[PDB]
Amino acid sequence: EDVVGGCC
Amino acid sequence: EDVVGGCC
Amino acid sequence: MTEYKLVVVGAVGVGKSALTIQLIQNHFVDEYDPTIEDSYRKQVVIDGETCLLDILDTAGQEEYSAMRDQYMRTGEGFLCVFAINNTKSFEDIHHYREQIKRVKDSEDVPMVLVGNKCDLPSRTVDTKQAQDLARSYGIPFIETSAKTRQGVDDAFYTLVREIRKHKE
Amino acid sequence: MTEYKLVVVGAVGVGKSALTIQLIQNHFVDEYDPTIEDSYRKQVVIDGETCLLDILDTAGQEEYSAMRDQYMRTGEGFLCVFAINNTKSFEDIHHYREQIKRVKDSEDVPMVLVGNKCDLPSRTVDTKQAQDLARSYGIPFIETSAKTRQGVDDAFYTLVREIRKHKE
Amino acid sequence: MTEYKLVVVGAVGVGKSALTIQLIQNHFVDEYDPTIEDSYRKQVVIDGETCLLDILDTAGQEEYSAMRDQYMRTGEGFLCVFAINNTKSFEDIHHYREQIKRVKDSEDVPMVLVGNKCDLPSRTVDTKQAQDLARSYGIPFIETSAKTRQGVDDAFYTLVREIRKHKE
Amino acid sequence: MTEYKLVVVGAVGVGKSALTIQLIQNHFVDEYDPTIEDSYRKQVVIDGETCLLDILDTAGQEEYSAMRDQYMRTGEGFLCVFAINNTKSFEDIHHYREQIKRVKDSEDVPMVLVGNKCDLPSRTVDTKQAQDLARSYGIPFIETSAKTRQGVDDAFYTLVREIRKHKE
Amino acid sequence: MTEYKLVVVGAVGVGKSALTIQLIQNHFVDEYDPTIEDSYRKQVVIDGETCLLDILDTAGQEEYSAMRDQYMRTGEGFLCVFAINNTKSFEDIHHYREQIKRVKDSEDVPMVLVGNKCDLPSRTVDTKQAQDLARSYGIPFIETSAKTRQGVDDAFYTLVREIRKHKE
Numbered sequence A, B: 001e002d003v004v005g006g007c008c
Numbered sequence C, D, E, F, G: 001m002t003e004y005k006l007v008v009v010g011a012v013g014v015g016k017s018a019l020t021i022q023l024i025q026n027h028f029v030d031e032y033d034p035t036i037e038d039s040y041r042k043q044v045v046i047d048g049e050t051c052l053l054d055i056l057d058t059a060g061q062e063e064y065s066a067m068r069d070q071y072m073r074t075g076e077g078f079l080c081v082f083a084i085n086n087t088k089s090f091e092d093i094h095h096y097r098e099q100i101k102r103v104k105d106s107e108d109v110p111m112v113l114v115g116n117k118c119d120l121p122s123r124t125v126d127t128k129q130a131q132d133l134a135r136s137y138g139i140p141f142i143e144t145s146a147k148t149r150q151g152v153d154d155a156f157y158t159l160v161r162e163i164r165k166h167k168e
């Protein structure tokens, strides 16, 4: 969302 | 990094 | 009031714990549980500037703590520690640097390469090798001994100075 | 109007009740039943912000009120109180901090270390010890006297400021 | 070892309590109950003479303390305190002097005029006015700040010196 | 193989059990029944000498076990343990030393003063106090943490060294 | 149609798998199961000569494959691989050479010493040491990086050239 974010 | 651990 | 979040990383038994305790408590701990990860604060004056040090002493658990994740993310500077009489620990450094760059997703993370156990006569990693590595990375290299306190204030304070540069 | 939930903890007789009553009712209580746990509200202006303080005055009796449970859970900040003339109460602080971190399951809980009874000549806990403890925890340390009102508003308001930072 | 009985008088909130606590306890009290009258002792060295200071911090209670009566009677020197940012407190001084002369039934009572809160930029009582008043009374005028300890030792020690002169 | 009979004494909850279990079982016990007195053996190598340590972990029940009686009598060395965050436990040490001298009816009993819980931030017994006490007794003083294993081998091994001197 | 049977040997994780896959599949494998032994064929042109490379990537498992036995026996050339940032892997080389000499029961087996991971900034095995070792053995020494493909064709092709000489 924010901190994973796009990342997994 | 921890957040795949090692996930390809 | 400036807080610096410092994260101490490196192979087990290089003296991450001994260094942190030396800085914080002014004594040398010969036996500090290798698995114990903890955080420590200290108010220090560095170049006339009073600051709060907030230090994570990592003990590379593979056990998921929300705090540790937050710490790697929000850690502002990293001491990458090896022992000067432990070649493996030196080989590992590259790994730690890589990890930190990936976590921070940046090529410019304040970092200091620390060669600990400088008090030992049984040196296997020469200073110039360590200096070459630090140079390639464009970061300071400091020799420390947690036993004698050699360069201990230096290591931590240098990381703060690295952070100060980065922020400014 | 923002509510702040504050929880006052500490060894029995250190003045949790006397402090809270001082803040709320502007008088010093000679005798407040050691077992009585209660909550109190007060409207205050802190840094131009009007807010409601919602304070749990803990008494640690072995009768468990649903309000107190809710308070530990939903308590936003904790005054950890000792008396400056009571060494045991100072020793106990660590215990209280531990408990709060466990309840909150967080290493970052807004908290203020409070040395109460600063009016007394019989000091056994020197300020530096208290300051060092607060420093190690990275929280404010405030000296209070429930009797003379010294630092009373300060202790509570400082906790609010700690909460404000944390939330934002 | 000579004991000096000092009595601190002046309008409410001028900092009689803050001054006395500064002298005695070497810190500045944010909140000292305006009504609380107390006495304080401290052993000090003044010009190489070790002396005991015995100080009554008056709070303008009407309500009778045997100690306070005895103190006005047996008080050897009086700090007459005003705040430099409080005109009323300055206007009151004359009243305090009058009262002291009547209690002591003497026009020659060791006394120091003290302008407190000298740290404040919002001065309303100029130094010259205070100097003129002190001159008319033939007593020292000392500027103090209980917050910054400015002139604090000076004010009390000067009163002792006034007493020493009187006794000689 | 030499057996050394060590007896661990001190105020309740100072960590006699936690220390002994750390030495024997290499882990830190959160909860070990304060009243449970047990004996433990461990084979160790100290200065190249393999020896059996036979340790009585006293629990100070006023309840007489034949094992404990035999142990006070046949105990060769005593760890006198306090907690560095427990002033009372430190005040008690003198009492323990006295008792040991009376049991042994000797002024020359191998003994080590141990300040446990050195991992705690709430220190109330400063090291110099402890050092002065140990010095007055002419015995080693060692700081330990049963939690982090700091000084644990050290405390026990030092007592053995004290015994070795005494016997030889 | 000339087939060359090449066998890649060396300490686990030196990059035997990474090198072979690079040569064969033109990409760099971060994770290749340390236990998996596999064979790979590729048609290549070396000095204008088209040949088939038949490469065994050893994983030093124990468990018997008929193919592996045949390969050690009928392996024509051996890449002896170490990592330049892994001292142990270098120390192991002599062992691998010994093994090969015994299998072939010959002093003259086509062989290339390969220092892999030459992309790394953390070098612990200097090139001169590796050159000295290769020279003592009378075999080529080649620096490779499976990550950057540096010297990859070179290592394998050089072994082929060694075999060609030997056959002739």
Ligand SMILES: Nc1nc2c(ncn2[C@@H]2O[C@H](COP(=O)(O)OP(=O)(O)O)[C@@H](O)[C@H]2O)c(=O)[nH]1
Pocket: C010, C011, C012, C013, C014, C015, C016, C017, C018, C019, C029, C030, C031, C032, C033, C034, C058, C059, C116, C117, C118, C119, C120, C144, C145, C146, C147, C148
């Ligand atoms: N010679 C020497 N030994 C050290 C030094 N610092 C620590 N040690 C020893 O290294 C061991 C482990 O330290 P620790 O910090 O727990 O390991 P880490 O997790 O790698 O940091 C202890 O036995 C220490 O006594 C030093 O500066 N010099």
Ligand SMILES: Nc1nc2c(ncn2[C@@H]2O[C@H](COP(=O)(O)OP(=O)(O)O)[C@@H](O)[C@H]2O)c(=O)[nH]1
Pocket: D010, D011, D012, D013, D014, D015, D016, D017, D018, D019, D029, D030, D031, D032, D033, D034, D116, D117, D118, D119, D120, D144, D145, D146, D147, D148
């Ligand atoms: N000097 C001083 N005394 C206090 C203060 N607060 C409470 N006391 C006294 O200490 C005693 C215990 O107070 P209490 O409020 O019950 O302590 P608690 O159990 O921690 O709440 C009371 O009898 C009060 O008179 C303070 O701030 N300063």
Ligand SMILES: Nc1nc2c(ncn2[C@@H]2O[C@H](COP(=O)(O)OP(=O)(O)O)[C@@H](O)[C@H]2O)c(=O)[nH]1
Pocket: E011, E012, E013, E014, E015, E016, E017, E018, E019, E029, E030, E031, E032, E033, E034, E035, E116, E117, E118, E119, E120, E144, E145, E146, E147, E148
């Ligand atoms: N700015 C300033 N404030 C002072 C000084 N001395 C005392 N105060 C403050 O005046 C306020 C209330 O008056 P207080 O000193 O309690 O007066 P008292 O009750 O008559 O002794 C408090 O905030 C004190 O801290 C000073 O020199 N400068």
Ligand SMILES: Nc1nc2c(ncn2[C@@H]2O[C@H](COP(=O)(O)OP(=O)(O)O)[C@@H](O)[C@H]2O)c(=O)[nH]1
Pocket: F010, F011, F012, F013, F014, F015, F016, F017, F018, F019, F029, F030, F031, F032, F033, F034, F035, F057, F058, F059, F116, F117, F118, F119, F120, F144, F145, F146, F147, F148
């Ligand atoms: N945090 C900490 N706790 C300790 C240490 N040593 C002992 N303890 C504690 O000691 C308490 C009970 O101590 P125990 O070993 O039963 O003492 P004994 O019954 O007096 O022998 C436990 O709750 C542990 O938490 C130490 O070095 N650090």
Ligand SMILES: Nc1nc2c(ncn2[C@@H]2O[C@H](COP(=O)(O)OP(=O)(O)O)[C@@H](O)[C@H]2O)c(=O)[nH]1
Pocket: G010, G011, G012, G013, G014, G015, G016, G017, G018, G019, G029, G030, G031, G032, G033, G034, G059, G116, G117, G118, G119, G120, G144, G145, G146, G147, G148
């Ligand atoms: N920088 C670099 N990394 C390599 C090289 N070869 C392998 N690696 C890395 O280290 C590992 C080597 O591959 P691996 O198959 O486990 O080694 P093998 O069992 O000796 O075949 C992989 O994780 C790669 O990410 C190389 O030449 N250079």
Ligand SMILES: [Mg+2]
Pocket: C016, C017, C032, C033, C034, C035, C036, C037, C057, C058, C059
């Ligand atoms: Mg550690």
Ligand SMILES: [Mg+2]
Pocket: D013, D016, D017, D033, D034, D035, D036, D057, D058, D059
């Ligand atoms: Mg209470």
Ligand SMILES: [Mg+2]
Pocket: E013, E016, E017, E033, E034, E035, E036, E057, E058, E059, E060
């Ligand atoms: Mg007053």
Ligand SMILES: [Mg+2]
Pocket: F013, F016, F017, F032, F033, F034, F035, F036, F058, F059
């Ligand atoms: Mg026990």
Ligand SMILES: [Mg+2]
Pocket: G013, G016, G017, G032, G033, G034, G035, G036, G059
């Ligand atoms: Mg492999």
